[PDB]
Ligand binder design. Sequence first.
Ligand code: 6DT
Ligand code: MG
Ligand code: ZN
Length: 315
Amino acid sequence: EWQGLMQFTLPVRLCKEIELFHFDIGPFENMWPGIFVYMVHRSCGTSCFELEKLCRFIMSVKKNYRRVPYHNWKHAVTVAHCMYAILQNNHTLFTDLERKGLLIACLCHDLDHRGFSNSYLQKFDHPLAALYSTSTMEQHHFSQTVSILQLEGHNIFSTLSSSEYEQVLEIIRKAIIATDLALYFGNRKQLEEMYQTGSLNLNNQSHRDRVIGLMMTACDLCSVTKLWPVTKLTANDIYAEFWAEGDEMKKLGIQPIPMMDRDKKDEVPQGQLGFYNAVAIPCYTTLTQILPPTEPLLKACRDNLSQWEKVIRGE
Ligand SMILES: Cn1ccc2ncnc(Oc3ccc(Nc4nc5ccccc5[nH]4)cc3)c21
Ligand SMILES: [Mg+2]
Ligand SMILES: [Zn+2]
């Protein structure tokens, strides 16, 4: 498996399209791992990692994604691609070590996701909720990454110094924890505060960490920044999984919130519009303000929002 991956070269007809924010990995399933290789080479250099160790890592990450409807291997690569495009349009603002870490983090941010929310696992007293009280799945996701890195021939940061190793693990740690949507609101409120007061300093490490946190959220939800046909199909995958979580509550004899209730299928468009306005728009809006080149994401988000309006209005 990892043998054929090293030989892979990306089709030339996709060299300029892959750089676009709205790029859809959808119809390139068996190219996905090589696409991640491509992106890492272009953003961090070809002589950044040993190819063998990197390919072993990608393949092990792949297999440790469960066959769930949304939080699966495809989602990982999609989030990784969004991050790539962000980093490519903001060349100088991020260090070499941050580029390596963030792309790895995006690929690993949902490792061994069971298809259940933190809310579900905490309610029903899951061993993972017993272990990690808050940001349950996210701490597991990172745990999983560490385990994979500590496998033989999988340590892709082996060439980095002892000091550089513990720095990139912290960058990875924070980026993955930040993908907990519950933490997003506080983060974005703080970043908006700093912008309008003009107290935002990118020399400030804790300010850097916050900006990165927002980038993680923006990449995580980047399905809303694709073209309407792609976005609509991704919406189907999210709800299929949400509804599967809903069914598991019904089997336990407990009625789930309408978001996860499949009998509330009609209220999906209204739920979507609400989500775009409350969560998606402010996200990409604040990100655009901090990183102006990321504007095509906001533009793309506005487009889809208006499409859900047409749905609600029946057009
Ligand atoms: C996580 N995620 C990543 C990308 C992405 N794209 C779209 N939706 C996402 O997640 C949701 C899904 C649903 C809701 N709300 C909701 N309210 C409802 C009320 C009734 C019925 C369904 C309802 N659904 C909010 C967020 C996405
Ligand atoms: Mg997650
Ligand atoms: Zn995710």
